[PDB]
Amino acid sequence: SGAIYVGNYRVVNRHLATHNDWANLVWEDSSRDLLVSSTTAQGCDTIARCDCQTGVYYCSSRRKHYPVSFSKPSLIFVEASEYYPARYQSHLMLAVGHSEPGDCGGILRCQHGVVGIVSTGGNGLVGFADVRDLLWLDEE
Ligand SMILES: Cc1nc2c(CN3C[C@@H](C(N)=O)CCC3=O)c(F)ccc2[nH]1
Ligand SMILES: [Zn+2]
């Protein structure tokens, strides 16, 4: 589990969104595994607006933050899980690192801010849904 809290937005994995998220929906995209809902309180996270391909992510199944090198956002084939059939997920970045299904939502960040959240995994790989192209998170 986990979310990004930027401005009056809450960014979560679409497959983990709650009824309150769906009832206060701003934007969702199944192909990216992302959903954004509105919040009453202002959040403290800042979104990275950069080209970094190194950063650090939080792994709840180890209670640890790990440094990683990750690929550029791309269209990657992801195996079937409890939440999606086997399909192509867009704007996904891969790294070598530990992840279990409940690790989804952990933040990946660089010196510029939040880069994305854990969305996929297995066999010593971890995949992150990028948010750096969602410029509208910084306003309105
Ligand atoms: C064996 C294994 N499968 C893992 C998944 C699979 N997965 C893919 C998600 C997606 N975005 O398609 C939907 C939810 C989900 O559980 C992880 F996300 C993380 C670690 C994993 N280890
Ligand atoms: Zn950066």
Side-chain angles (χ1 to χ4, degrees), residues 48-52 54 110-113 115 132:
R49 302 296 181 199
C50 68
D51 49 24
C52 293
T54 64
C110 67
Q111 63 259 36
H112 307 105
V115 172
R132 295 178 289 188

Side-chain angles (χ1 to χ4, degrees), residues 15 33 78 81 83-84 87 89 99-101 104 119-122:
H15 73 274
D33 185 43
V78 179
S81 68
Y83 294 94
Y84 296 104
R87 80 209 204 282
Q89 182 160 320
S99 62
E100 295 180 30
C104 285
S119 177
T120 74

Side-chain angles (χ1 to χ4, degrees), residues 26-45:
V26 173
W27 169 85
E28 53 86 24
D29 183 323
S30 171
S31 75
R32 295 179 67 152
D33 185 43
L34 285 180
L35 181 147
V36 178
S37 60
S38 61
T39 64
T40 56
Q42 287 181 285
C44 293
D45 294 319

Side-chain angles (χ1 to χ4, degrees), residues 111-134:
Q111 63 259 36
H112 307 105
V114 175
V115 172
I117 52 172
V118 174
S119 177
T120 74
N123 295 308
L125 298 162
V126 54
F128 308 97
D130 184 49
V131 299
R132 295 178 289 188
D133 65 312
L134 303 175

